[PDB]
């Protein structure tokens, strides 16, 4: 609960950087940024979500989400209709370019990241002491 | 279940947002500031030591060190040792009191971090 040293924060930065590195090749191919991909994952699992529902799923506020949604719309991947975000036909087709079930294997693909195990380790060490 | 990966991204974003103002005033990026925190805790460390402390590889650390050198904050000398300059030591003062001590402590109450820890405690 309480952080007494910087190790968990350093591990958090490293783990998130490692996640970006893991997906850099694919993101480049799909022409999306990491955050944009997270939004697409949410819609591929459940389409036609309110901006609020998406934000709850990603733990992101409306202010962080709005700019990302505006960029996905500019790419012709989603449509915004009042508060409801829905994939366009091209947004639905994009899923097949990221594999068979991208929204189901996303976090599993990074489960063995050394950086993530180190992060889990730091949390354990905080608990220990 | 992708909640851990989403929580991870959100927590990192929240940390960046928390320190955005400070970083602008120090003219540093987030990763560059992390390197300074390590050096402020203890100076004259090898690139290998710094990497182990930050859980980063030399490749990721090289660009960061180059920008800190350009800012005249650290010097690099042959292992390779990174040492703070007079400007690097003086910078600590502008980041405030005991910057290397309150950094992660200040994140203790960040909601996004509490959420991440909740998911981390399932693995």
From TrEMBL, chain A:
Main location group: cytoplasm
Classification via Gene3D superfamilies: Winged helix-like DNA-binding domain superfamily/Winged helix DNA-binding domain
SUPFAM superfamilies: Winged helix' DNA-binding domain
Residue span, HTH marR-type domain: 5-128
Pfam family, one: Staph_reg_Sar_Rot
Residue ranges of coiled coil: none
Molecular function via GO: DNA binding; DNA-binding transcription factor activity
Keyword list, A-Z: Cytoplasm, DNA-binding, Transcription, Transcription regulation
GO cellular component: cytoplasm
Protein location: Cytoplasm
GO biological process: one example: response to stress
Name the UniProt record assigns to this protein: MarR family transcriptional regulator
Protein encoded by which gene: ohrR
TrEMBL record, chain B:
Compartment(s) of residence: Cytoplasm
GO BP term (any one): response to stress
Gene Ontology molecular functions: DNA binding; DNA-binding transcription factor activity
Region forming the signal peptide: none
Top-level taxon: Bacteria
Protein name, per record: MarR family transcriptional regulator
First-listed, main subcellular location of the protein, grouped into a coarse class: cytoplasm
From-to range in the entire protein, with total length: 18 to 146 of 153
HTH marR-type domain boundaries: 1-123
GO CC, any one term: cytoplasm
Organism: Xanthomonas campestris pv. phaseoli
Keywords noted in UniProt: Cytoplasm, DNA-binding, Transcription, Transcription regulation
């Amino acid at each position: 609960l309480l952080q007494l040293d910087n190790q968990l924060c350093f591990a958090l930065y490293s783990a998130n950087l490692a996640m970006h590195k893991l997906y850099r090749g694919l993101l480049k191919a799909l022409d999306l940024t990491y955050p944009q991909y997270l939004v697409m994952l949410v819609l591929w699992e459940t389409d036609e979500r309110s901006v609020s529902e998406i934000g709850e799923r990603l733990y992101l506020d409306s202010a962080t989400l709005t700019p990302l949604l505006k960029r996905l719309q500019a790419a012709g991947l989603v449509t915004r209709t009042r508060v409801i975000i829905a994939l366009t036909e091209t947004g639905r087709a994009l899923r097949s370019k990221a594999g068979a079930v991208p929204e189901q294997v996303f976090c599993a693909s990074a489960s063995s990241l050394d950086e993530l195990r180190q992060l889990k380790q730091e949390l354990e060490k905080l608990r220990s002491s």
